[PDB]
Amino acid sequence: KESAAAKFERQHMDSGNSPSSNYCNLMMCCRKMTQGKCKPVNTFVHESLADVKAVCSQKKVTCKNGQTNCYQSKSTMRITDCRETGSSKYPNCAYKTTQVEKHIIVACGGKPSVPVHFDASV
Template sequence: MAFQKNRSLLLFLFLTLLRLGLIQPSDGQSHMYQRFLRQHVDTQGTGGSSGYCNLMMQRRGMTSPQCKPVNTFIHESISDINRICSSCNTTCKNGQMNCYRGTVRVTECTDTGAAKSPNCRYWARTNTRPVVIACNGNPRVPVHFDQ
């Protein structure tokens, strides 16, 4: 139930920002941005435990058809995450120049390999660290967690 509430809140916020003209991604960018939010953003959570990772990975659809090996959740406001896209750009792992650095609170969930999909099991590591995020659009919005 809390997941549905958070998801509804994120969707409401995104639609409000679109209506206000603060975000105007193309259809492709909108899809990529929504995917980024689903896979990497938890503004309400603090992470930190294997139970958190097990629950969030399943709720966010990353345990089927196979266990996603590693996923990072960012625990900052959406506006703070979007703000990373206006920092100085840096080279992405794929050589593109649309990546940006920021320092955020994160929980990294890593598959333990102890269970098969959809009952994946994860261990958690929570800290504040630098991240690299790929951004696209005008204005730029995050579309990929690079590192």
């Protein structure tokens, strides 16, 4: 099975330069979030893996789903919000790309504790 840490890197990490309008359409497919159905909303982080992992050492916050292994980034990060457009209907998974700068909240799990879910941005 794919590990949660790997699953997080594939689904949310894209360290480097922020994205064009077609970014989300290629990333949601390339990174495998358009198989079987279209993933509604998804966020990619453009900061480094280290900066993202370090978030597990930062401010603890309760996840949106009530879980309590979430951490909020001290600093804002360059991220891209990917949202399904109304015209998108699997298999025609279309996405709206939005670049933003926000704190991220990620769930951390495993040993050692690394990001396993992207909870939200603030």
